[PDB]
Scaffold this active site. Structure first.
Site, PDB file in Angstrom:
ATOM      1  N   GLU A  86       0.915  -0.680  -5.214  1.00 24.84           N
ATOM      2  CA  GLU A  86       0.033   0.486  -5.594  1.00 24.84           C
ATOM      3  C   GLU A  86       0.838   1.881  -5.825  1.00 24.84           C
ATOM      4  O   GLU A  86       1.242   2.525  -5.005  1.00 24.84           O
ATOM      5  CB  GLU A  86      -0.938   0.696  -4.291  1.00 24.84           C
ATOM      6  CG  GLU A  86      -1.799   2.132  -4.638  1.00 24.84           C
ATOM      7  CD  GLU A  86      -2.862   2.358  -3.463  1.00 24.84           C
ATOM      8  OE1 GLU A  86      -2.840   1.474  -2.691  1.00 24.84           O
ATOM      9  OE2 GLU A  86      -3.280   3.365  -3.366  1.00 24.84           O
ATOM     10  N   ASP A 126       0.754  -1.170   0.018  1.00 26.66           N
ATOM     11  CA  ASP A 126      -0.158  -0.005  -0.108  1.00 26.66           C
ATOM     12  C   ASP A 126       0.821   1.206  -0.093  1.00 26.66           C
ATOM     13  O   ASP A 126       1.672   1.429   0.896  1.00 26.66           O
ATOM     14  CB  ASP A 126      -0.921  -0.130   1.089  1.00 26.66           C
ATOM     15  CG  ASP A 126      -1.899   1.136   1.208  1.00 26.66           C
ATOM     16  OD1 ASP A 126      -2.883   1.017   0.585  1.00 26.66           O
ATOM     17  OD2 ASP A 126      -1.589   2.092   2.123  1.00 26.66           O
TER      18      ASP A 126
HETATM   19  O1  LIG Z   1      -3.057   7.885  -5.929  1.00 30.24           O
HETATM   20  C1  LIG Z   1      -3.517   6.643  -5.317  1.00 30.24           C
HETATM   21  C2  LIG Z   1      -4.143   6.764  -3.941  1.00 30.24           C
HETATM   22  C3  LIG Z   1      -3.759   6.261  -3.102  1.00 30.24           C
HETATM   23  C4  LIG Z   1      -4.142   6.120  -1.550  1.00 30.24           C
HETATM   24  N1  LIG Z   1      -4.844   4.496  -1.480  1.00 30.24           N
HETATM   25  C5  LIG Z   1      -4.130   3.734  -0.389  1.00 30.24           C
HETATM   26  C6  LIG Z   1      -3.609   4.327   0.817  1.00 30.24           C
HETATM   27  C7  LIG Z   1      -4.352   4.761   1.882  1.00 30.24           C
HETATM   28  C8  LIG Z   1      -3.478   4.416   3.083  1.00 30.24           C
HETATM   29  O2  LIG Z   1      -4.164   4.838   4.389  1.00 30.24           O
HETATM   30  C9  LIG Z   1      -5.712   4.305   2.100  1.00 30.24           C
HETATM   31  O3  LIG Z   1      -6.760   5.264   2.609  1.00 30.24           O
HETATM   32  C10 LIG Z   1      -6.283   3.528   0.852  1.00 30.24           C
HETATM   33  O4  LIG Z   1      -7.597   2.877   1.079  1.00 30.24           O
HETATM   34  C11 LIG Z   1      -5.215   2.882   0.147  1.00 30.24           C
HETATM   35  O5  LIG Z   1      -5.716   1.951  -0.870  1.00 30.24           O
HETATM   36  C12 LIG Z   1      -5.355   6.951  -1.625  1.00 30.24           C
HETATM   37  O6  LIG Z   1      -6.150   6.779  -0.420  1.00 30.24           O
HETATM   38  C13 LIG Z   1      -6.277   7.127  -2.571  1.00 30.24           C
HETATM   39  O7  LIG Z   1      -7.234   8.195  -2.372  1.00 30.24           O
HETATM   40  C14 LIG Z   1      -5.684   7.382  -3.845  1.00 30.24           C
HETATM   41  O8  LIG Z   1      -6.357   7.031  -5.326  1.00 30.24           O
END
Ligand SMILES: OCC1=C[C@H](N[C@H]2C[C@H](CO)[C@@H](O)[C@H](O)[C@H]2O)[C@H](O)[C@@H](O)[C@@H]1O
Ligand SMILES: OCC1=C[C@H](N[C@H]2C[C@H](CO)[C@@H](O)[C@H](O)[C@H]2O)[C@H](O)[C@@H](O)[C@@H]1O
Ligand SMILES: OCC1=C[C@H](N[C@H]2C[C@H](CO)[C@@H](O)[C@H](O)[C@H]2O)[C@H](O)[C@@H](O)[C@@H]1O
Ligand SMILES: [Ca+2]
Ligand SMILES: [Ca+2]
Ligand SMILES: [Ca+2]
Ligand SMILES: [Mg+2]
Ligand SMILES: [Mg+2]
Ligand SMILES: [Mg+2]
Lengths: 548, 548, 548
Positions: free
Chosen positions: A246, A204
């Protein structure tokens, strides 16, 4: 090749899938009881959202204990039965490894916020687990992510008398990664689960680990080296387990998270660049942006596979599109103020396409036909909608709709007692949208996603072939080939709402007859200059085999 | 009489029946451990699918070596034990002789493709083994058989720079039977297995041997000559062995493949004419087509016996039916395009009849009571389904289902590692459909089949008697007699789902009582005009003896 | 007329139907979640087994609190939710009222057994609630019902130092209905549940309430009088509710339990006399017992309806058949010692008929075609088996089998933690026999049962008509008419395993044309003197109307 390239991924939230005991919260017992559903659908690998003990201020992404199961979800024993029942069915399972940060409730942080020195004058080794500042003037003018909530990336801890760093919520303090002990704490979290037989991790928020002054604090090679050694840890101690990143960056930056052939990093990355250009192209009825951004992707290592997706548990991100493109997407896809959040759109797939099954099936076929492995988002295969009455992104995380019985079959408890209310509106509620209904419906979206995933399985060029875009003469029509093992596939798609015509540049293929992957019905032979005329109806997808 | 006239046949595929050693592939040691089951079922002759070495592009019907055992199936030693043990149990075994064509991988074709003359000038004797043409315009307007894969019956070989002939796949070049050296390569291939004790052969694709301009290239008098010399050989060097032809042609062309008394050909041919009419009659509740295609069958030589069958490892073939007959069958029996392939329906027997045991039992009683010798397709005796996600006709060749343990009792390897996945769906899966289940169940399809064969064995009129259809006054009721050695059987069968009334023309038998073969329960004697009134329940079959 | 004459009843056990919270025990939340299953099956009234607090020494028929919900099953709120959801779907519900006896753990009996006079010399009002004897020599020569367990109907209480009466287990002391306070306590139990909306009561063991010297202590006028009082109370205070009586007596004494038009008793009684004769006749292939016993039943009151059943939660009772009939039944249906218990046979329907669906379907149609309202025992509609390694009659009370996942869908707890273990044998286990499987199987027993009920709905003469038996000339053929509203149903049934012929006496219907209720297929018109020849297959059921 490796198992993750032939895999169909399915992202679910244990707390939201099946409540097994009547308390309103999904858990591993109930999830286990649904495993045959996921098998029969044509899924291969379950990605589970964070299952860790947590105060759930970010729904589980604020981890308070990397080495347990959240009490809502049952116990570690329930975890071990689930993983057992999973593999017994031929399914892989990966977890969500929240590396960048922990909850303010994590024991590490409650100790770090005592101070840099203890009341008995000892050093506090837990204080340098996070990133601290006395005034909070470092890294300024770097992007806030949760812009609708956090006014800065530095917040003042009242008991530690200093500012601490957080790319996400105030209650999710960034971990400090120059400290090789923290590097070791998460190597040993990865180990705790890979020991229990887990088949890998989605990792993540990888771009924002290391923070360096005078840079954007994304994609720093210092961050990439932390990942380079995470991969080596896995390569050596746990071969054949999947690492997936991610990384929502622009195309050239995204491929860096795969690594090079000599220095590997991630096996798979999410194809965050192509995702928004699908939706743009549908409303503009012009597929140029799909081909443009796909041509801005450098080749990936031998071991690399893209992970393709249409939606997930987060908002539809508009962080990596231009200002014009972001403005268009708000106008096309976010008519109500409420659907906006943090540079993005918090709506499910089916609502975004106006519940048009023709458009839904179109983008699904393109998800299934682009190079990489697909990930379906739980409930999209039956047409689930959303509840924007729910805060943050939890509007897309409502309980899975299993039947039209109590709470949609998610729990025996009442909808108001479920963690999130199961959707009940006239369009998307479980009276209308549920699994049991669509197993009896001869033509349901569920049947259609199962059939289409079968159609894919039987054509390995979908999973492993190359991509060659093909000129059509019409921006509404997107044509490309997939070649692998001498099978050549031709994948023509209309992105417009009426009948379009085109001239496909099939010159490499003169003398070949395209025939349909379904029903083996043959089209006319390519001849002459190889310029092949087509008409398509609105949102049609032609899936074709080039017989030589 | 001859042994194949009294025999019950059973078609299986070694790769797919039983895996001895745990690697996912069925083998001869595994097949050997199941001979007792086959013996106890009431089976007399095993027909095995092609066991030769092969790249398996047509599941071993592309032969790379006529004088070996495919390594999947064990060794030639394993073969020899198997045939000893089968013979030890009173079982006959026949192999599959793939005459019309070999695999592109056969060392014959790898040589013939190097040109009409060798690199040292001398002529390449293997070149005339196959059929060639410089432009491939010969024999045009001849039917394609695998219409979903092959655009033409000519394909360019890139190295020999000419076209070769193939009635089937492009990796299955036809053998040239004008060349009398090829006739002798197959006589000697036959001789190899007959020398080892094998009791006969099913011969594959016998209509398509010889091709000649201005003809359809089917049932050519030249082809028949080659068959006549094949039977003349076997009659001389190996008396008592069996030749069985796969000849799917219309009634008047099929009987030719027996030869005459003076010039014999096969001992047995598959009664393809009646096979699709069995299904039509069930759907139309109209037994007319059965009596008409049976009536168009001219009398066969003294030595000859029909081989009656409901299904096999191939599609249900719609090649020798009218255009309206074919279109009717697609409607009634192929609701999905997936269910179609190459002018036919690729589905197992039980799915074809909607898993309605009453219908399954009825077609079996007709299979057992038409004149000839019945063949059972492996697994239909416990009601196996199919898997239409598997390519070509593989979906009816999934592993046998022995019990509810690991991979249905076919292998200790995971289903994913079996050569074909053992079916696990909720209706036909090995948890529900398997042999252990049905040996314990006092009333299973398996025990019903074993008992019906037992009942047939008791009445030799079933195997050798004549066939007189009888007027019923109801197209739904099929009635006929069988007469042999002083026994007269009367076989009334309802092809309709509701109760049906009938008036049987038993005028010849006035004064005689009908009585049941099972239970010796007599019906009222026939009197007066001998118009015998009968009622029937849905799908009922009456097996009866006419006393004397 | 009254709703229970058109109702299809369904008997289930909450602890055994569906567990809604993982604790291995069925509950009302779980049962609520299965109501659409029962609705779609065509069920109208749910008869729920005892749901009261109880030590479960006889599975809840030893009641310890008549006004509460056993904690295994949930709370009284859960019961209220279930009744609301059942009625919201047009389903009636009735409870099981255990009138003759309470648990020895009942507060009343813990009080009664203290003695006639309490420690303070004052009298004990609860002593006279139960039946006491000083040496236990009264009512000698009176049948023991539970002969395999109880040696006497009098047992010595340790503390009271006297003998108490129990027609059943020693932990189920008989209530004393000569005491009028007792009579008031069960009007009061009735009122409690009848006040929450419950639609009526199956009344347990009603023949054995009053005991008198010099009698059998069965069917006594004093017992009938208490029952008339019970009918009077409900008739006045809760109009429209159902009193259904369990009285297995001989045809003459059974009919008394309806009362008279002037002094009414029960609305319905189970047709116990006919139940064994259905099984006798199937084994003898001779249906005279069915007719002789049906004809010893006198006409019933206007409000009377019979309740027809094949099996229930008890043993197949052989109490009210002759010694020779009982010995036959043991020979035919109890090969193993283990299968008998107290004058009766403790096996489910499908095991009794060797899992033969032809015979299961035949007796189910007779069940639906005899005069009365039918009651289906849960799981019999999918062919469930038994577990004769469980004690008493629990072998037929194993959990409902819903799907093939954990515990068959009954619970998320493991089978070894379920109240009774769900069946897992190769013939009847939930891996072969379950609801979800049979919803996908186009020809499953479940769909058959649903459709046969729908056939029954369409012809009110089944629920309401009269019954005239029809000569056939063949004891194996049972023929009768049902006449109501000028619609005339002819029902013919073969009880033998081979073809049978007969001559229906249809003289009253010359000139009528019989047609199948399914399909409308016509048999010949009755001509001449109405002597109608028919032939039947094995276990055939002709369901015919006589078109006027
Ligand atoms: O740019 C990519 C992203 C990363 C982030 N996503 C991850 C990181 C966050 C870590 O706490 C989390 O809220 C989210 O659900 C995860 O899948 C963010 O929250 C998204 O809004 C966003 O689209
Ligand atoms: O016309 C009859 C047939 C012959 C063919 N069957 C044989 C020929 C093929 C030879 O390679 C082989 O695939 C098939 O299994 C054989 O039994 C064809 O494939 C069938 O589809 C069809 O029913
Ligand atoms: O004589 C008929 C019967 C009545 C009795 N059935 C009821 C009375 C018993 C009361 O405790 C109980 O065990 C049983 O379940 C009830 O349905 C008896 O137990 C049965 O064996 C028997 O078939
Ligand atoms: Ca960081
Ligand atoms: Ca040929
Ligand atoms: Ca009593
Ligand atoms: Mg829970
Ligand atoms: Mg093997
Ligand atoms: Mg419970």
């Amino acid at each position: 090749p490796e198992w993750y390239k032939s895999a169909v991924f399915y992202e679910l939230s244990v707390r939201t899938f099946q409540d097994g005991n009547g308390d309103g919260k999904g858990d591993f017992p109930g999830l286990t009881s649904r495993l045959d559903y996921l098998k029969n659908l044509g899924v291969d690998c379950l990605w589970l959202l964070p299952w860790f003990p947590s105060p759930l201020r970010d729904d589980g992404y604020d981890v308070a204990d990397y080495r347990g199961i959240h009490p809502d979800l049952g116990t570690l024993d329930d975890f071990k039965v689930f993983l057992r029942e999973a593999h017994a069915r031929g399914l892989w399972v990966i977890g969500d490894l929240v590396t960048n940060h922990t909850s303010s409730d994590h024991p590490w942080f409650q100790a770090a916020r005592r101070g840099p020195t203890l009341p008995d004058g000892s050093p506090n080794e837990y204080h340098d687990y996070y990133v601290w500042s006395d005034e909070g003037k470092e890294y300024a003018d770097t992007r806030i992510i949760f812009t609708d909530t956090e006014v800065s990336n530095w917040t003042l801890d009242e008991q530690a008398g200093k500012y601490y760093w957080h790319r996400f919520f105030a209650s999710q303090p960034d971990l400090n990664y120059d400290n090789p002990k923290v590097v070791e704490e998460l190597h040993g979290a990865a180990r705790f689960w890979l020991d229990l037989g887990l088949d890998g991790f989605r990792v993540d928020a990888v771009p924002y680990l290391i923070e360096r002054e005078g840079t954007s604090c994304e994609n720093l090679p210092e961050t990439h080296e932390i990942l380079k050694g995470f991969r080596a840890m896995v390569d050596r101690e746990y071969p054949g387990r999947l690492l997936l990143a991610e990384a929502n960056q622009w195309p050239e930056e995204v491929v860096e998270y795969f690594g090079t052939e000599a220095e590997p990093e991630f096996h798979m990355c999410f194809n965050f660049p192509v995702m928004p250009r699908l939706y743009m192209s549908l409303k503009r009825e012009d597929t140029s942006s799909i081909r443009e951004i796909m041509g801005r992707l450098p080749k990936i290592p031998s071991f690399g596979q893209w992970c393709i997706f249409l939606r997930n548990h987060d908002e539809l991100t508009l962080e990596m599109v231009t200002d014009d493109e972001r403005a268009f997407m708000y106008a096309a896809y976010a008519p109500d103020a409420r659907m906006k959040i943090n540079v993005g759109i918090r709506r499910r797939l089916a609502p975004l396409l106006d519940n048009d099954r023709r458009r839904i099936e179109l983008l699904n076929t393109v998800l299934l036909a682009l190079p990489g492995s697909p990930v379906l988002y739980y409930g999209d295969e039956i047409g689930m909608g959303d509840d924007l009455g729910l805060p943050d992104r939890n509007g897309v995380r409502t309980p899975m709709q299993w039947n039209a019985g109590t709470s949609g079959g998610f729990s025996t408890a009442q909808p108001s007692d479920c963690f999130f209310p199961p959707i009940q509106d006239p369009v998307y509620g479980f009276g209308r949208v549920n699994v049991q209904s669509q197993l009896q419906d001869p033509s349901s979206l569920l049947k259609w996603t199962a059939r289409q995933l079968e159609l894919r399985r039987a054509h390995p060029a979908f999973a492993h072939g190359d991509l060659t875009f093909i000129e059509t003469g019409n921006p509404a029509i997107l044509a490309f080939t997939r070649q692998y093992d001498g099978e050549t596939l031709l994948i023509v798609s209309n992105f417009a709402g009426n009948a379009q015509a085109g001239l496909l540049d099939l010159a490499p293929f003169v003398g070949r007859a395209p025939v349909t992957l379904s029903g083996a019905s043959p089209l006319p032979v390519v001849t002459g200059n190889g310029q092949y005329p087509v008409v398509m109806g609105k949102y049609d997808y032609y899936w074709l085999r080039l017989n030589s």
